């Protein structure tokens, strides 16, 4: 075994009844000295390194040409002036195995952490030396973390897309379905995950040009999408991941769920296609009263009313559909469907549960469209318009398709530096640059919506790490108070930066005037309620930082009304997975699954304690499965009220908790305002 791995295994070797947590720093030192410093290509100067990387098609030349070499050298000096040291071996291992640039033969390492960060900052700044140095300070302090696509591929020629997600609306036509397959493959080859809304597709047994019982339902389209994502497997290095979302009132909802059953035959089962279920409040009401529900055939509704099933408010039009003889449906049991959802999530973790009315109750851009579906990570909730892809040599009607411009704030490092405002504004600027520089030619709706909506996703991570390292239990009300204050601050400064960008560019996002930002309805709870901490301990955490008040929110509302808002969406909390290791952070705002992660790499067993774990804060780092899921729902809903998009909310379930417990958690999440539920992780 290697020396660093052997030293890492001494974490679990307990002496005097305590874990040898100090051995981890020795593991980082051994790892670097024995592997990294030996297998990193070193050049006589930064000029030679840059020439080698651009000439050998490792870096793009366009973004480096915006700076003189003096500016680039100063930026790299700023990155290395911090003298950043990885505090855990797993952080360095993750970076130098996944995100560090390597030679074409993968034998050596071309990029350090201070090199990847410098290149990403130079990409973000776009010719500005001071902005590049600010980004370098932001990332080397680990206050803000660009998403895995953005961090990996910024300024590199051998890349994919910096966009993490692609949310596609699939219209009810063979041409539209074929274009959905094409766009799904063209966006999977770019690396980003693709989510598709299949609620517009007509159900099984529907008519294709007045011949009845002709359709095979959305399950055939899921088969096509699953094989399309399998084909676009990105070399197999990361398997093609795709999501499919269906409204729970869609007739195919039972067959939609039947594909995730283990007992399901290979003739119906889909493997690479994750599934999500969109649940309007009407379904929850029907389940609550234990009255028979109806799943409708979408094409009958489209023929009768001229509008798609998912474009109509089901809370208002459910009765109209039911008493309509020209609308086809079959009676179902909403409580039986809820139990089926609970057991499917217990067995496989699917489907993602999207509470449509919870999303659209506080959705700012309902005028553009209601949020009909979420992304593969079940955290992006944006307005989308379907695209009517017509026959060849006929002009297509291009709609709006959602894309992830993701970035995560490290709550621990953000609040240690007392720079919530600066970090949020710089992250918003970086995400704006990523959205602007994204130009996807094979996805027309994605490109059009990226140009028009200018939506970005600014998430946060290391919530549990910050709370445990500050002596706050995740389920404690003080933790919820801190999350309320912190995410209200984040929302305030994200809105402020969006309005500042709109003022400086003279343009807002498309159809901004109809949004609640323009009408001032979005800021109602912010100008009516004070989100300052209610606990003295929590208020001390924000000391040295100006917490926005009701009057400050009124000034921000006036500023937005006068100048507009550049981004339709700004905040969405992604799961923050493999990049959380590099930032030495807990994943997302979720609680930690295990105090010490047991990971297998090759023939070695590697251990990763969560950052800041020690004897004093051992019980503050409570495992997620040990937590009360209701209090985690409370925490997320406290965070959710300050996030305009959704949060990737994973349910951590014990083996002893039945499907009724999972359904209770789901219904409490719906009752508390949770927008989406990502996963049901059973231990």
């Amino acid at each position: 075994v290697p020396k660093w791995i052997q030293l890492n295994n001494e974490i679990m070797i307990q002496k005097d009844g305590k874990f040898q947590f100090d051995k981890d720093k020795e593991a980082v030192h051994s790892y670097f000295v024995d592997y990294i410093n030996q297998n990193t290509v070193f050049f006589h100067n930064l000029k030679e390194k840059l020439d080698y990387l651009v000439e050998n098609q490792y870096y793009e030349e366009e973004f480096l040409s915006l700076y003189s070499f003096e500016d680039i050298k100063e930026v790299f000096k700023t990155a290395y002036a911090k003298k950043f040291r990885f505090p855990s071996f797993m952080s360095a291992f993750k970076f130098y195995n996944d995100y560090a640039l390597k030679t074409n033969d993968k034998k050596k390492i071309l990029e350090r952490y201070e090199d990847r960060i410098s290149i990403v900052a130079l990409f973000f700044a776009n010719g500005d030396t001071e902005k590049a140095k600010e980004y370098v300070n932001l990332m080397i302090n680990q206050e803000y973390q660009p998403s895995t696509p953005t961090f990996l591929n910024a300024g590199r020629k051998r890349r994919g897309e910096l966009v993490s997600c692609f949310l596609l609306e699939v219209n009810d036509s063979l041409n539209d379905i074929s274009r959905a397959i094409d766009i799904s493959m063209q966006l999977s080859k770019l690396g980003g995950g693709v989510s598709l809304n299949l609620s517009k597709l007509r159900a099984k047994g529907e008519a294709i040009k007045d011949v009845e019982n002709a359709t095979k339902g959305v399950v055939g389209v899921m088969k096509l999408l699953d094989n399309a994502f399998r084909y676009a497997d990105q070399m197999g290095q990361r398997q093609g991941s795709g999501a499919a979302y269906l409204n729970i009132f869609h007739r195919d909802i039972n067959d939609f769920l039947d594909t995730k059953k283990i007992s399901a035959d290979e003739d119906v089962r889909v493997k690479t296609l994750s599934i999500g279920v969109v649940i309007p409040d009407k379904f929850v009401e029907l389940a609550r009263e234990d009255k028979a529900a109806y799943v409708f055939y979408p094409h009958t509704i489209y023929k009768e009313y001229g509008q798609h099933m998912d474009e109509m408010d089901m809370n208002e039009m459910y009765d109209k559909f039911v008493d309509n003889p020209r609308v086809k449906k079959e009676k179902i049991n909403p409580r039986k469907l809820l139990e089926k959802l609970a057991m499917l999530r217990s067995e496989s973790g699917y489907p993602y549960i999207m509470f449509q009315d919870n999303v659209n109750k506080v959705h700012a851009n309902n005028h553009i469209s209601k949020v009909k579906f979420s992304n593969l990570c079940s955290e992006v909730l944006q307005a989308s318009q379907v695209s009517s892809y017509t026959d060849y040599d006929e002009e297509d009607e291009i709609g709006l398709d959602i894309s992830c411009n993701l970035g995560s704030l490290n709550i621990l490092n953000v609040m240690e530096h007392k720079s919530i405002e600066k970090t949020v504004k710089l992250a918003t600027d970086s995400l704006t640059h990523v959205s602007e520089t994204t130009d996807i030619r094979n996805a027309p709706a994605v490109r059009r919506a990226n140009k028009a909506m200018k939506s970005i996703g600014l998430g946060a991570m290391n919530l549990h790490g910050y709370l445990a390292q500050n002596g706050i239990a995740y389920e404690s009300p003080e933790a919820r108070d801190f999350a309320n204050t912190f995410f209200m601050m984040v929302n305030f400064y994200s809105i402020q930066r969006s309005a500042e960008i709109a003022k400086e560019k003279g343009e807002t996002f498309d159809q901004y005037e109809g949004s609640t930002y323009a009408t001032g309805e979005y800021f109602d709870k912010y100008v009516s309620t004070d989100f300052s901490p209610k606990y003295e301990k929590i208020a001390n955490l924000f000391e040295g930082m100006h917490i926005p008040t009701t009057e400050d929110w009124k000034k921000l509302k006036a500023f937005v009304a006068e100048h507009g808002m550049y981004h339709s969406y700004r905040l969405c909390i992604a799961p923050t997975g493999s990049i959380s290791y590099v930032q030495s952070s807990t994943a997302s705002v979720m609680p930690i699954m295990e105090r010490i992660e047991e990971r297998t790499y090759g023939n070695s067993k590697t251990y990763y304690p969560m950052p800041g774990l020690a004897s004093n804060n051992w019980f503050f780092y409570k495992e997620a499965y040990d937590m009360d899921m209701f209090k985690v729902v409370d925490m997320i809903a406290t965070i959710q009220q300050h996030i305009d998009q959704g949060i990737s909310f994973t349910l951590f379930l014990k083996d002893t908790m039945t499907t009724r417990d999972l359904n209770r958690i789901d219904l409490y999440a719906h009752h508390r305002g949770i927008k989406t539920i990502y996963y049901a992780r059973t231990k």
Partner: peptide, 12 residues
């Protein structure tokens, strides 16, 4: 298990 829902799981 596969414990069914009752009327009291829909109010909190």
């Amino acid at each position: 298990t596969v414990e069914p829902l009752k009327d009291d799981d829909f109010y909190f």
